Design an enzyme around this catalytic site. Structure first.
Site, short mmCIF file in Angstrom:
data_model
loop_
_atom_site.label_atom_id
_atom_site.label_comp_id
_atom_site.label_asym_id
_atom_site.label_seq_id
_atom_site.Cartn_x
_atom_site.Cartn_y
_atom_site.Cartn_z
N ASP B 168 0.86 -0.98 -0.08
CA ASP B 168 0.16 -0.14 0.25
C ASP B 168 1.04 1.33 -0.27
O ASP B 168 0.90 2.05 -1.08
CB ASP B 168 -0.79 -0.08 1.01
N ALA B 171 -1.40 4.83 0.78
CA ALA B 171 -2.52 4.65 0.12
C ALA B 171 -2.84 5.80 -0.44
O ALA B 171 -3.28 6.54 0.07
CB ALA B 171 -3.14 4.98 1.87
N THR B 172 -1.61 5.70 -1.72
CA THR B 172 -2.05 5.69 -3.61
C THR B 172 -3.48 6.13 -3.62
O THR B 172 -4.54 6.73 -3.92
CB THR B 172 -0.96 6.36 -3.57
N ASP B 213 2.66 -8.01 7.62
CA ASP B 213 2.95 -8.73 6.16
C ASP B 213 2.43 -9.71 5.05
O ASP B 213 1.56 -10.23 5.25
CB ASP B 213 4.21 -9.44 6.50
N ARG B 215 3.29 -11.98 3.88
CA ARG B 215 3.12 -13.11 3.65
C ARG B 215 2.84 -13.58 4.79
O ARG B 215 3.01 -15.40 4.84
CB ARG B 215 5.42 -13.33 3.84
N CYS B 237 10.48 -1.13 -6.03
CA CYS B 237 11.96 -0.66 -6.70
C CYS B 237 13.20 0.18 -6.08
O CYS B 237 13.66 1.00 -6.45
CB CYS B 237 11.75 0.15 -7.88
N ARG B 407 8.87 6.40 -3.21
CA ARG B 407 9.21 5.23 -3.48
C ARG B 407 7.24 5.35 -4.43
O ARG B 407 6.80 4.16 -4.69
CB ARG B 407 8.48 4.32 -2.51
#
Ligand SMILES: Nc1ncnc2c1ncn2[C@@H]1O[C@H](CSCC[C@H](N)C(=O)O)[C@@H](O)[C@H]1O
Ligand SMILES: Nc1ncnc2c1ncn2[C@@H]1O[C@H](CSCC[C@H](N)C(=O)O)[C@@H](O)[C@H]1O
Ligand SMILES: [Zn+2]
Ligand SMILES: [Zn+2]
Ligand SMILES: [Zn+2]
Ligand SMILES: [Zn+2]
Ligand SMILES: [Zn+2]
Ligand SMILES: [Zn+2]
Lengths: 427, 428
Positions: B168, B171-172, B213, B215, B237, B407
């Site tokens: 997330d 929260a874009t 997480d 996972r 990235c 990011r």
């Protein structure tokens, strides 16, 4: 250092040895050490899962047996034993002057092979093979639901099985299905190495419809090649093991190919509401990463079963099997056709010093007072392949040995595939 | 060497320059070079995909523009241009005595910025931005079927959208959905970094249900948290780009987390026969591996769409979007609220040297009071189209908060992508 202070405090009878983690000196004791006396923290459990069955090119263990780390290890002189004990653990459990005097002892046995068995600070716990078998049922950190059990189809309604075999190799899965006498409607098998293609082509007489790259295969292909009844496969363990000297990465290459198995498994899985019997098997090697093992267990949504081939064959071939095949857990039975001694697998005129081979004293055979490699047809016998299985094309010995070693253990895969006779037609 | 002999044979008019691969001299000419004159072999295509948008810490390109390799590159002195030409290519295409004399020229422009734009052995092909846009539709090596188009639900039958957002951040995605006016039934969001949790918690008023997480999210969790109508996500990235000096691996860490998105996508997908409208978006950066991009395309079973934010915002934020959102291909339109110049995104009393800033010695982009200065954090928020003072929630340092901003997805790009979802879900 803190380890050594804590063991110093234990020898004063001020601390129990069972209240301390003997591997790294951690107070966070959750488990008990399976082989020897002491506690066991969870980080040392992860290190023990990764490192215990790792062996050097020597044939002996890569690291110490106690702590799975250490600095300089002491290799055992007993026959067929490959264990190593680092100097720092023997400074504790035997004493700070007995490691130096035990190096001078030229016929030196390790403490899992010590004829006496009991020592002052270190004593060997009695049911250690039972606790080694229970230690992989102790992996409940990954808790899941049990695999869904489908009720058996009647014998008059059974049909020939249809198998999508990824990473086929030398067609071990179809060979085992034929050994069980199960009718095979079709056997789709993706594979890239030509030599393994050719082995399967000749040994299974053109019945196998050979395929291109697994990554190239799509869901449309999976739908159009008929419904599949059994999807099997095994990730490459050439880079994933610690035996290859070129360990540039761990899950570059091989991990990708696992995810290819994952995708085509979902592509071959029937829908919810389609209650037809479907089954799948994945295979991997035990010398693997913990977070690796977790990610595999999570994606396939199942707990791994470790199965060592020593129980049924002449090798040490301990492999994780994920799947939903009924009776995957049940203990292995070795038939009288299966050779448990290496000497039975040898050619005539050859005598083996070893009773088992660790393929993951390099050359294991004394013939004519000379050290020699197992011949290729003997390696075939060791894993339980039929005699002269890989003599199809004009390939070198090094390539052909390499072609044999990667393969699944044939009585192990027989043991696994055997309850599928209850679900499909027979010859 | 061989390619230098080849170019020698071309200048004698015994060979066409368009029949040879000008990058490495290969005779296997499949493509034409998009920017300049010459062929293009497929290996050089893969090297061009990987290397073309790779920039050093300098801000300028990591490698040569012509061959994507080279030995020693020549950086361009023109303003806002960041291209580099290696010495070995200029030995051919301009001549073996003109590179040395062009180093001595102190105001040196490069050959994409040359006023004349027509040199002896190197000329510039005319519709090169069009061919740069077509070059990513030229990636038909990975051929797939088109994404399934679902017929639109009537406006009286529309319901609030339910989003499973993985990775997330700040929260874009929910912010852009609220900007469009779409009713959101619930917004589940997995995220690990506390600062980005906190930004979302304050800016979206406790509406977001936060998970641990990715996972730790099982298929049972996906089933019990309601059917989802829109699953979105974007891989990290930080390691995947060439801008981080610590590139120990490439798909250790970040690659894993992609597959976590892949799994939970399958867990959230409705069954075959369940024809309810379901949508998904994945995002990744363009400075990535080819076989990486292949594996991603094959797993998500779709062709990527490159979208650069320069068309709508003040940054160069070129990102791959996989998905099935309708009109993911259609060209970007920049509204009047969006600021295409950098200067409009500056504060008052500050004037910009650049018209666009991309950040993945003019390292600091602002000339204020005879002094070089970084973009302030609220301006970086303006550059990506965030609301003003979006990240000023908790007592966090400036370095961390800039890192938290960089990011993030580009807000008018994500508005452009999410906009046709209004046709499928309820409005406020
Ligand atoms: N992309 C790919 N597609 C198919 N097979 C592959 C592959 N990459 C590697 N392989 C092959 O898959 C095998 C990995 S393990 C093979 C074990 C197999 N069950 C057997 O009994 O032979 C190797 O033979 C390897 O060469
Ligand atoms: N395992 C994990 N689970 C969830 N979020 C993670 C994660 N590992 C990294 N992240 C976070 O995911 C983000 C990667 S990219 C974030 C971009 C996001 N769309 C935005 O606009 O903010 C980073 O914020 C990173 O800290
Ligand atoms: Zn410990
Ligand atoms: Zn040790
Ligand atoms: Zn021993
Ligand atoms: Zn080339
Ligand atoms: Zn160059
Ligand atoms: Zn220029």
């Amino acid at each position: 250092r803190t380890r050594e202070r804590l063991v110093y405090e234990v020898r004063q009878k001020c601390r129990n040895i069972e209240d301390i983690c003997i591997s790294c000196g951690s107070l966070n004791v959750t488990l008990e050490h399976p082989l020897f006396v002491g506690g066991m923290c969870q980080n040392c459990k992860n290190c023990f899962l990764e490192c215990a069955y790792q062996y050097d090119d020597d044939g002996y263990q890569s690291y110490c047996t106690i702590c799975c780390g250490g600095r300089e290890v002491l290799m055992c002189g007993n026959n067929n034993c490959c264990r190593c004990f680092c100097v720092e653990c023997v400074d504790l459990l035997v004493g700070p002057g007995a490691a130096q005097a035990a190096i001078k002892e030229d016929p030196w046995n390790c403490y899992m092979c010590g004829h006496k068995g009991t020592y002052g600070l270190l004593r060997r716990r009695e049911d250690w093979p039972s606790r080694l078998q229970m230690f992989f049922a102790n992996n409940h950190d990954q808790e899941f639901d049990p695999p869904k059990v489908y009720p058996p189809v009647p014998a008059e309604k059974r049909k020939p099985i249809r198998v999508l075999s990824l990473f086929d190799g030398i067609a071990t899965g179809l060979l085992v299905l034929k050994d069980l006498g199960i009718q095979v409607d079709r056997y789709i098998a993706s594979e890239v190495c030509e030599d393994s293609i050719t082995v399967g082509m000749v040994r299974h007489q053109g019945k196998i419809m050979y395929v291109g790259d697994v990554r190239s295969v799509t869901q449309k292909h999976i739908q159009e090649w008929g419904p599949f009844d059994l999807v099997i496969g095994g990730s490459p363990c050439n880079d994933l093991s610690i035996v290859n000297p070129a360990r540039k990465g761990l899950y570059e290459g091989t991990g990708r190919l696992f995810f290819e198995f994952y995708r085509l498994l979902h592509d071959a899985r029937p829908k919810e509401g389609d209650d037809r019997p479907f089954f799948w098997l994945f295979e991997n090697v035990v010398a693997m990463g913990v977070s690796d093992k977790r990610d595999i267990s999570r994606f396939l949504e199942s707990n791994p079963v470790m199965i060592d081939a020593k129980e049924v064959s002449a090798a040490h071939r301990a492999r994780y099997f994920w799947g939903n095949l009924p009776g995957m857990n049940r203990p292995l039975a070795s038939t009288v056709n299966d050779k448990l001694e290496l000497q039975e697998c040898l050619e005539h005129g050859r005598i083996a010093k070893f009773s088992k081979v660790r393929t993951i004293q390099h050359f294991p055979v004394f013939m004519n007072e000379k050290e020699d490699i197992l011949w290729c047809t003997e390696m075939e016998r060791v894993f339980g392949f039929p005699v002269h299985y890989t003599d199809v094309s004009n390939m070198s010995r090094l390539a052909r040995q390499r072609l044999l070693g990667r393969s699944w253990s044939v009585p192990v895969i027989r043991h696994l595939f055997a309850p599928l006779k209850e679900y499909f037609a027979c010859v």
